[PDB]
């Protein structure tokens, strides 16, 4: 009864991780975007190696 919070949360987060991209109202498939978090981690990695 006490891990029901985490199982409903992980269902929501697992649906959120594979979030899909819509054309207008219909879905575009084979669409891959680079997030601002992923781009900032790329920038931080490249910046740390050049500082090294």
């Amino acid at each position: 009864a006490k891990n029901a919070s985490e199982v409903s949360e992980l269902l929501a987060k697992s649906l959120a991780e594979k979030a899909v991209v819509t054309e207008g109202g219909k879905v575009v498939e084979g669409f891959s975007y680079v997030s601002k978090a992923v781009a900032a981690k790329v920038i931080a990695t490249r910046r740390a190696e050049v500082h090294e």
Binding site: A48, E49, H51, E52
Partner: protein, 49 residues
């Protein structure tokens, strides 16, 4: 032997960024010139004798 500056360049390039700053006293000690320590005190040489 090989020259000490190329050893500095190689062993500095081989360290990681976390390993770099504490390795610097070791790398320096591997590039320091050999100054031979005081060896065995014999008596007088055969030419001194």
């Amino acid at each position: 032997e090989g020259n000490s500056v190329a050893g500095i360049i190689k062993s500095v390039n081989e360290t990681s960024g976390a390993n770099l700053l504490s390795s610097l006293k070791t790398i320096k000690a591997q590039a320091a010139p050999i100054y031979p320590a005081a060896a065995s005190s014999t008596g007088y040489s055969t030419q001194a004798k």
